């Protein structure tokens, strides 16, 4: 039973969950990978990894992905959670130098992952391994776009580091802009393409229906994370959360902020339903009788289907994952699964 304040009947009724058939193998393979890359200590991997549901989250999203593509995405995503944890810990412990160096190494590795496969920082080596594998699926033009997007993500994380160190809470619009980067909207959107086996031409992926459907899917995910992770984030002195920006710059109470975030989340769903019709119509138009047209149509249709799957995957992930279960921690400011 989902807590009343977080429950979204529309998701539960109109966005039925899906699960990729590779999930059982995926869960164990990512667990092994976390252990082999030493991204988490062995006993924490044993106690916590499965319960974190990181593979479940990706397997409920990129339906139809080749197993190897799903595996690389899942490893990358688990890495990404561990990076969020590292960033948090560096901030909490005032490790400005260690963060600066990691930030620099990630920019470098992103451009030449092969060279960093056995780097001394296991977090960098893990990143390089997943990124090298992601770069092996589609042409270099897709790789360059992924890299362009992720350079931007790294810098958003740096801005977060400085906000939290300088005690700054972003304004609401400032936050909403930053959140498209810290949640990595365009990375998850990029990864739809290797999942359906086709780098989409700019003309296709920048079609206003495709763009808007892709945006709304990610806005839902980010803002629903904000709604559900708010307790953990308040407990851990995190300042980046739509609710926190509203309490700060619009003078709402906690109750009022939760309500306003919920409303913005619900609106995302019905805005998506409307644009989804246009995106699927676009998918139909691409099927003009030609082989290429059919390829493009099928890929857009699969991608839009997965933009829809993201809603239900993110929704349930927040109620299933140990990551947000702050009520169960002895110290609410220090999640048990992070390296402190
Ligand atoms: C740190 C969390 N994460 C995933 C790695 C980084 C952008 C965003 C996210 C949170 C919850 C669900 C889905 C994505
Ligand atoms: Mg976080
Ligand atoms: Mg974060
Ligand atoms: Mg959060």
UniProtKB/Swiss-Prot annotation:
Chain residues that bind Mg(2+) 3: 225, 229, 233
Q: List where the motif DDXXD motif lies.
A: 84-88
Which SUPFAM superfamilies does the protein's record reference?
Terpenoid synthases
Q: Which UniProt keywords apply?
A: Lyase, Magnesium, Metal-binding
Q: Which Pfam families match?
A: Terpene_syn_C_2 (PF19086)
Is Nucleotide-binding among the key words of this record? no
Q: Which InterPro entries match?
A: Isoprenoid_synthase_dom_sf (IPR008949), IsozizSyn (IPR054543), Terpene_cyclase-like_2 (IPR034686)
Pathway membership? Sesquiterpene biosynthesis; epi-isozizaene biosynthesis
Could you say which residues bind Mg(2+) 1 here? 84, 88
Quote the PANTHER family the UniProt record gives.
BETA-PINACENE SYNTHASE-RELATED, TERPENE SYNTHASE
Quote the protein name from its UniProt record. Epi-isozizaene synthase
Give the species this sequence originates from. Answer: Streptomyces coelicolor (strain ATCC BAA-471 / A3(2) / M145)
**Taxonomic lineage of this organism?**
Bacteria, Bacillati, Actinomycetota, Actinomycetes, Kitasatosporales
């Amino acid at each position: 039973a989902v807590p009343p304040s977080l429950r979204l009947p529309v998701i539960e009724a109109a966005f039925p969950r899906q699960l990729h058939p590779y999930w059982p193998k995926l869960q164990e393979t990512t667990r092994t990978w976390l252990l082999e890359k030493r991204l988490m200590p062995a006993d924490k991997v044993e106690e916590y990894a499965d319960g974190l549901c990181y593979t479940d989250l990706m397997a409920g999203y990129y339906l139809g992905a080749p197993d190897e593509v799903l595996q690389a995405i899942a490893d990358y995503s688990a890495w990404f959670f561990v990076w969020d944890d590292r960033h948090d810990r560096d901030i909490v412990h005032g490790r400005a130098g260690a963060w600066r160096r990691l930030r620099g190494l990630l920019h470098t590795a992103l451009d030449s992952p092969g060279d960093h496969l056995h780097h001394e920082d296991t977090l960098v080596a893990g990143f390089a391994d997943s990124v090298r594998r992601l770069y092996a699926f589609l042409p270099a033009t897709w790789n360059a776009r992924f890299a362009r997007h992720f350079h931007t993500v790294i810098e958003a994380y740096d801005r977060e580091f400085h906000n939290r160190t300088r005690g700054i809470v972003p304004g609401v619009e400032e936050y909403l802009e930053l959140r498209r980067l810290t949640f990595a909207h365009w990375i998850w959107t990029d990864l739809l393409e290797p999942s359906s086996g086709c780098e989409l031409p700019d003309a296709v992926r920048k079609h206003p229906a495709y763009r808007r459907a892709a945006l709304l899917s990610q806005e839902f995910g980010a803002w629903y994370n904000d709604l559900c992770s708010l307790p953990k984030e308040i407990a851990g002195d995190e300042v980046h959360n739509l609710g926190i920006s509203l309490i700060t710059h619009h003078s709402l109470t906690l109750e009022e902020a939760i309500g306003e975030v919920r409303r913005r989340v619900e609106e995302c769903i019905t805005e998506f339903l409307a644009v989804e019709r246009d995106a699927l119509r676009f998918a139909d138009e691409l099927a003009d009788g030609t082989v290429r047209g059919k390829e493009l149509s099928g890929a857009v249709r699969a991608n839009v289907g997965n933009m829809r799957n993201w809603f239900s995957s993110v929704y349930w992930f927040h109620h299933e994952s140990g990551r947000y279960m702050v009520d169960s921690w002895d110290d609410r400011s220090t999640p048990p699964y992070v390296n402190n």
